Design brief:
The structure is a homodimer.
Chain A: E1 19-20, H1 29-42, H2 50-63, E2 67-71, H3 74-85, E3 90-94, H4 100-107, E4 111-115, H5 126-129, E5 137-143, H6 152-161, E6 165-169, E7 177-178, E8 181-182, E9 189-193, E10 206-210, H7 213-222, H8 244-274, E11 281-283, E12 297-301, H9 303-306, H10 310-319, E13 322-323, H11 347-355, E14 356-359, H12 367-392
Parallel strand pairs in A: 1-13, 3-4, 3-5, 5-6, 6-9
Antiparallel strand pairs in A: 2-10, 7-8, 9-10, 11-12, 12-14
Helix pairs in contact in A: 1-8, 2-8, 3-4, 3-7, 8-12, 10-12
Bound molecules: ligand T4K (2 copies).
Pfam family, one (chain B): DegT_DnrJ_EryC1
Keywords (chain B): Pyridoxal phosphate
Family (chain B): Belongs to the DegT/DnrJ/EryC1 family.
Chain lengths: ~400, ~400
């Protein structure tokens, strides 16, 4: 049995070099330090300095909008948006997303309201929205899943119908577009993320982008103790400021972006090719949905076809030093404190959540690495039944 | 002559601007070494080693077992509130930076303001019980300018009303009273490591406590509530400190003891250079217990000097001396609190209208102290004339 050579089965782990989904993409150290030197020299370290402003600029350009406010992280970005907009009560959003989408709002007292995805896209289904609306609904927050843009036009249409605002969690969408429109320019306002793990990172950081100047001014003021906000806000304000240092990392990362995308695309094609003709394993075709950054390599594992559940596949690879993640599983509607509360039906969400597996990518991964993983996946898929059986023992 | 004051058209007194809040320089080499190691490892956030070491150093300095490093002190308070399960009302001073009440308002809590002990500037424990209500969940004091709060007495009160006691220890790192370090005084305390503090991490803060459970709850919630068996009604958020911030903070802590010493020296120089100056009173923090002296504060008595705190600021400002009123006015006069109903806060108001923060830190030398002082001495000796000429 080739299964016994499986470290998972107590065999020897095939390789010494660990592969990790999320590995930050390398940068030009020299460029970063200059940037840091310059800020240290000026003694201007935070509170709206020149690096942040520069970043905000590039960021907004990329979104195809006029304004951007740089933040400490995207989650805080969601909170400012909500507060700045005076959102109240319920917010309709997919359950198929990272915990931060609902939690960000729940943290500041809002009520996430979960609606199903369009199984063909993985994004919030506009046709499921209306049924979720109530006297308490203030808005709709869609998620460009894996960078695929939502059906904003349709979503917008429903929104309108119920006198609701329309925003997007564009955490994964930097550099993505649909029908030539870039993500960040589709909602009333959108939130980007610059976490260490994204295509573009600033250690920790985010940005709220919008074409709405007034809205933009409120967010800016609220992110700075509510200072300089005529009339203030019932929320008061907070600290969600991006320091010059993060902006330094942020700009240097934006610099590498073009090449990161390229590698991402290449890595993607590579996986596609290495996993070709493998029943029950499918490489997610992000391209079908518009221009994608390819920061996420996702496959769906069909347990019926393969005879092995995604989870087990995960474990098997982890044992081999290949760290994958299930982005996302389960749906947020199954996480605390949502877990067990009444929710609209979410069969599409639940089904996808159980099949998804994210594989290592970015500048840290090359062909050889790819093959090693594809090969491991191919083994699992073609010998699932026996692998599961042997595990079952 | 006043005609000379750059504020009266005259030429600006010195060219090298002095800034309250200028960050103390650091050992860049030690900084870059740290950054390099983080970059190399490819571990940039999410509880990295620098962050862990920092938390360890910070907790030791606070005189407690645990510390959770955050993206900022404001978020620190929010994690603390939610982790704690606070609800409804929270009693705190109005004599503080906006962030104390705002931090809480932001997450839907109601700040309840109480007056300060005019003789300290800290939440007067007396005034506390009066503000209690059935909505009241906790008491949050502010170690004003590093000055340790009368914690014990406050605890008593808290205890009697079944409340919780926490402190916004934003400026209290390394301050102490009767040998007890700021950070070990309340149920938990929050420090700030903003670029402008004694200890800088660009942006950052930390929640310290001896309460291991609280500590773990704080930790889980700062990371989207992950690994919090049972979760929380708040859900969770992201308030993590990156390894980059940690690198800076460690470097900053490396130089802290020396900073304090310099600060201490600075204060003495200002004290001496400002003697025999009625209505211009150098705040003696030390009387409140050991202080790190990051804040050089003077009270301007308008009736005595014949010149208002504000105009003095303006005058100094024109001379290249950038000062700040820490804090003016009281939070109660701040939106959204403003206009809404509060207890009487005469002490807060009095104090708020007099305070003035002077430049200090490693960049401030004796010579500079002289220049500021000679500048203040003039305003306070010719308040009348100056004030009046202005008003033309
Ligand atoms: C839809 C959506 N909305 C909102 C947000 C919130 O935006 P932010 O507030 O974070 O700016 C996110 C975040 N989405 C991101 C999270 O930011 C990231 O922490 C990770 O959520 P975790 O999986 O819990 O992080 P972690 O388990 O510590 O690391 C994940 C993988 O990355 C690797 N890694 C991680 C870091 C930090 C590193 O420095 N190096 C590294 O190799 C280790 C591991 O294999 O991925 C999510 C999809 C999101 O996906
Ligand atoms: C009692 C209390 N609780 C809680 C907090 C919240 O801690 P954090 O969430 O920020 O970690 C604070 C913060 N207290 C600090 C604030 O952190 C700081 O922004 C500054 O509040 P601002 O005056 O509104 O920021 P800014 O006007 O840009 O700084 C004023 C002075 O600092 C100088 N400066 C500032 C920066 C950012 C710099 O990089 N270099 C520099 O020289 C310029 C100027 O003379 O001082 C406050 C008392 C606090 O005092």
């Amino acid at each position: 049995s080739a299964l016994s050579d499986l470290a998972f089965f107590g065999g020897p782990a095939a390789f010494d070099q660990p592969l990790l989904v999320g590995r930050p993409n390398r940068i030009d150290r020299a460029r970063l330090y200059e940037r840091l030197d310059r800020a240290l020299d000026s003694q201007w370290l935070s509170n709206g300095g020149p690096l942040v402003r520069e970043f905000e600029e590039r960021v907004a350009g990329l979104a195809g909008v006029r304004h951007a406010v740089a933040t400490c992280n995207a989650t805080a970005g969601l909170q400012l948006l909500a507060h700045a907009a005076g959102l109240t009560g319920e917010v309709i959003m997919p359950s198929m997303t990272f915990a931060a989408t609902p939690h960000a709002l729940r943290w500041i007292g809002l009520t996430p309201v979960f609606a199903d995805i369009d199984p063909d896209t993985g994004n919030l289904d506009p046709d499921q929205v209306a049924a979720a609306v109530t006297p308490r609904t203030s808005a709709v927050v869609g998620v460009h899943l894996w960078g695929r843009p939502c059906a904003a036009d349709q979503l917008r249409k429903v929104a309108d119908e119920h006198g609701l605002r329309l925003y997007f969690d564009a955490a994964h969408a930097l550099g993505c577009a649909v029908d030539g429109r870039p993500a960040g320019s589709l909602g009333d306002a959108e939130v980007f993320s610059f976490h260490a793990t994204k295509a573009v990172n600033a250690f920790e950081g985010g940005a709220v982008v919008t074409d709405d100047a007034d809205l933009a001014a409120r967010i800016r003021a609220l992110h700075n103790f509510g200072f300089d906000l005529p009339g203030g806000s019932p929320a008061g304000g907070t600290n969600a400021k991006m320091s010059e240092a993060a902006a330094a990392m942020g700009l240097t990362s934006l610099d590498a972006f073009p090449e990161v995308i390229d590698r991402n695309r290449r890595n993607h094609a590579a996986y596609r090719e290495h996993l070709a003709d493998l029943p029950g394993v499918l490489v997610a075709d992000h391209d079908r949905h518009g221009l994608n950054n390819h920061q996420y390599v996702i496959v769906e594992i069909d347990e019926a076809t393969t005879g092995i559940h995604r989870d087990l596949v995960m474990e098997v690879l982890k044992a081999e030093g290949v760290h994958t993640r299930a982005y996302f599983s389960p749906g947020c509607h199954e996480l605390e404190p949502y877990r067990g509360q009444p929710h609209a039906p979410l069969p599409h969400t639940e089904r996808l959540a159980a099949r998804v597996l994210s594989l290592p990518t970015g500048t840290a991964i090359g062909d050889d690495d790819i093959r090693r993983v594809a090969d491991l996946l191919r083994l699992c898929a073609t010998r699932g039944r026996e692998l599961t059986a042997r595990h079952r023992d």
